[PDB]
Design a binder for this molecule. Structure first.
Ligand SMILES: *[C@H]1O[C@H](CO)[C@@H](O[C@H]2O[C@H](CO)[C@@H](O)[C@H](O)[C@H]2NC(C)=O)[C@H](O)[C@H]1NC(C)=O
Ligand SMILES: *[C@H]1O[C@H](CO)[C@@H](O[C@H]2O[C@H](CO)[C@@H](O)[C@H](O)[C@H]2NC(C)=O)[C@H](O)[C@H]1NC(C)=O
Ligand SMILES: [Mg+2]
Ligand SMILES: [Mg+2]
Lengths: 481, 481
């Protein structure tokens, strides 16, 4: 039968944050053990280094511009959302009869009467926050018990963060030192109900770690030895340990595929309360490797042998791989990913040779910003971001503005993953890579027409979720902790 | 009985070059397996990030300025050398009756009739090159067989590189695609003779990898998928695999302690033919973490359990640990390291709380440049280096000149290992760290008197080794390949 699937997606976590990706001070013992008994990717990517667009791509296997998920990210007042018409992974697995569930951050739209909420896009069960946890004021929230407050305040002028159960406000705001526990219990129940009914489950655990502001429950506060960002990552790692114990307990180890990855690179503007891209350059919000190249682990005892692949892979390849693996059929839409099951099961290579990267603010005159083929990556356009400010590398700062490069900038990632030495600063291998990259951009730009933007549909304060509907004064009357 | 000891010391290799320290493209399967069954350090250091001074410190357990090993490094014409009077590790183990042997780079002086060569400082056996392999012309050497030449030429105006056997020129220059093989065989014989005579051996394998220029034998050329720097590191890794097979073969696994580390950070001026410091800042020649913080593995089946320590350690601590472990007595000299055996054997903590860092060009008016206590590191002086040029971080370049900092620059390495956020840009933990660091520098600077420099004793071309003594014209007549 099709396997049970657990998909864990961390938030704003970098390529060099796990212990097993080199960090000297992180504490992530469950993830290290999951890498030690599974496949660790060195070259897995996401196509855009922001939250919404990354989350859309993972769930539909489709580049975000195809469906209007740009520019920037959605906010609480947002009129727009991932069209209902797109077929998510949960829609696909639901129809093969999976009990589907999601815990955590959705950030894929809310809408008039919550029409874009997960329960409309194929999850049977949903306990979570519908957008990032810092999108609503937090100067009064506790981030670390007993009463260490969240740092800095978060977004102002908005309803507190709502924890939701399907479409109902279960709390507003929730108590952050307790979210993990709520989420483990929801996960545990979903698994056990699925055993109960003889059916495979699909759990989508989209953690809030390690997005700003950092938080954790008391068993982690001040125990990772890397400060708040670590306490928070140690908690995500202990949630993973929990899912894994529960998989043990129900005797489901060899029947569950478990993937871990993250939506985008670190927010280095948070300084030492943000993540680390390791040897890679820059972070969140850019098309440099540090923003789009993420950690990725695939673990399935008895099906995937412990190792390290350098094959190309993308979050875009998850719907199709999982569809394949569960004998479910693919939507009748154009897809930008591929089935990676041969690579997972060790009977093949990855079919993916290229990757296309779009910036946070794309546009049809400029098209794709960077393309990777084999070991080479070309950048046609370059640009820093305020999510990546504060590091010593000036190309990452928001003062590095949009600059065009013709001839393109060319890096061989196998020797210069750090993207330091432009090879066009000659050889025949180089001229052949340049001609291929130039043609893959012109091909893609000529063939993709952007979907009309969801984010420019604007904002309506009246779409903000409220615990005490119709109350007054808005937004402070919404609440019910 | 005291264990057999193998000490492997790589050259110009960075903290993020091993596969197990995060690199995405290196191929180092034996070292990864050695980490997987042993202790991987995250915070091991060397006190100066140049070759000579690092090599002096490791062998004597003493800060290089105590014995005149500054500034810069020794050259072939150098009149000076590590005084005979210093007691090396090999001297110490010899007197407890170890069969002692060294293969590889010595760079600790040559002298009039080779008075500073290893055979005078306690090794019974020596097959190697007495200084770096690029210190003599290489435009005509082959670096990768069948006939790929070394890149760039190396040093000019000098005798070719001599391979030596005790004090005799066995070759000049040697064939670089064959060094590994010579070195494995010498190592194999030394082990097996030591079994034969019922005595513990001490092998000091100081590889030439991954110093410029890169080279390897044909089984590695073009097979690591990271280019020449990788082919070269893949060869060092396959030498490690060989030592390990040989340890197996003689049935010596649980009686041999094996340590791996490297003398100093990467030479990023070699660009993509140089190493990678990972998330750490800068490289070779600086007192930033990327120049002084090195990979370090301790492997001893049945004595050291597989893990990861974050305890402080230094190359300075090796003589005393090994002396302890072999029940040999310590020289009657002031030592700057400590016995780490409790940490190795899991019955203790490291005794080391502080580390003192000197620059490549030290002086008694300025004294130590950086000090680490617990998780904090202070920099009293900062400075870039031409060994670290070419990266995006401007503080590493040789155009960043010697700048004093009062108040000191203060970093908490557990949250900011990358040395980005000066904490003095307030708190009581901070003021207490500042006062302690300021006092550890003034204490050390007032108590260490520098030894008179060996390197300023000057140069005599006549000290250059010659295969065909008395020939003419010097230096090209020296040779005998
Ligand atoms: C809200 O929606 C779902 C689905 O209706 C709730 O559903 C589940 O709850 C019970 C068992 O866990 C059963 O009464 C329902 O059959 C079951 N539904 C399915 C399809 O499994 C759920 O409790 C709410 N979501 C969550 C967990 O918050
Ligand atoms: C040069 O010096 C050493 C020591 O004299 C040589 O010594 C070893 O060689 C033989 C066995 O390997 C024996 O004849 C000697 O007893 C032995 N010496 C010791 C003390 O072990 C050695 O071959 C030369 N160095 C090397 C290996 O190059
Ligand atoms: Mg995100
Ligand atoms: Mg060196």
């Amino acid at each position: 039968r099709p396997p049970n699937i657990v998909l864990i997606f961390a938030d704003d976590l970098g390529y060099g944050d796990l212990g097993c990706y080199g960090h000297p001070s992180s504490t992530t013992p469950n993830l290290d053990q999951l890498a030690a008994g599974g496949l660790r990717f060195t070259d897995f990517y996401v196509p855009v280094s922001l939250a919404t667009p990354s989350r859309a791509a993972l769930l539909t296997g489709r580049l975000p511009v195809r469906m209007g998920m740009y520019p920037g990210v959605l906010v609480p007042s947002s009129r727009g959302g991932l069209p209902l018409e797109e077929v998510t992974v949960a829609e696909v697995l639901a129809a093969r009869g999976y009990l589907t569930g999601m815990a955590g951050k959705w950030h894929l739209g809310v809408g008039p009467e919550g029409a874009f909420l997960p329960p409309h896009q194929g999850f049977h069960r949903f306990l979570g926050i519908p957008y990032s946890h810092d999108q609503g004021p937090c100067q009064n929230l506790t981030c670390f018990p007993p009463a260490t407050p969240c740092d800095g305040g978060c977004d102002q002028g908005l309803v507190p963060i709502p924890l939701l159960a399907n479409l109902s406000v279960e709390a507003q705001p929730p108590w952050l030192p307790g979210l993990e526990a709520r989420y483990m219990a929801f996960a545990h129940d979903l698994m056990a109900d699925a055993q109960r009914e003889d059916r495979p489950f699909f759990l989508y655990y989209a953690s809030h770690h390690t997005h700003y502001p950092q938080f954790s429950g008391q068993s982690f506060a001040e125990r990772s030895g890397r400060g708040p960002f670590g306490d928070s990552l140690m908690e995500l790692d202990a949630a993973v340990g929990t899912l894994m114990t529960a998989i043990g307990d129900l005797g489901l180890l060899e029947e569950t595929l478990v993937i871990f990855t993250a939506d985008n690179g670190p927010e280095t503007m948070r300084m030492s309360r943000g993540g680390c891209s390791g040897l890679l350059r820059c972070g969140k919000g850019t098309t440099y490797e540090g923003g789009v190249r993420e950690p990725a682990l695939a673990f399935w005892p008895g099906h995937i042998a412990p190792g390290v692949t350098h094959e190309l892979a993308s979050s875009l390849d998850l719907l199709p791989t999982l569809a394949a693996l569960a004998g479910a059929p693919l939507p009748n839409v154009t897809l930008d990913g591929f089935d990676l099951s041969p690579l997972l099961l060790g009977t093949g290579k990855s079919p993916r040779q290229s990757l296309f990267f779009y910036p946070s603010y794309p546009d049809e005159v400029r098209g794709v910003f960077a393309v990777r083929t084999g070991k080479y990556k070309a950048h046609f356009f370059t640009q820093g971001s305020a999510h990546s400010d504060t590091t010593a590398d000036p190309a990452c700062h928001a003062s590095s503005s949009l600059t065009a490069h013709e001839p393109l900038l060319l890096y061989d990632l196998s020797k210069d993953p750090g993207e330091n030495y432009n090879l066009l600063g000659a050889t025949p291998e180089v001229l052949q890579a340049l001609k291929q990259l130039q043609l893959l951009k012109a091909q893609l730009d000529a063939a993709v027409t952007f979907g009309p933007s969801q984010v420019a549909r604007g904002e309506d304060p009246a779409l903000q979720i409220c615990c005490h509907p119709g109350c007054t004064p808005r937004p402070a009357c919404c609440h019910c902790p």
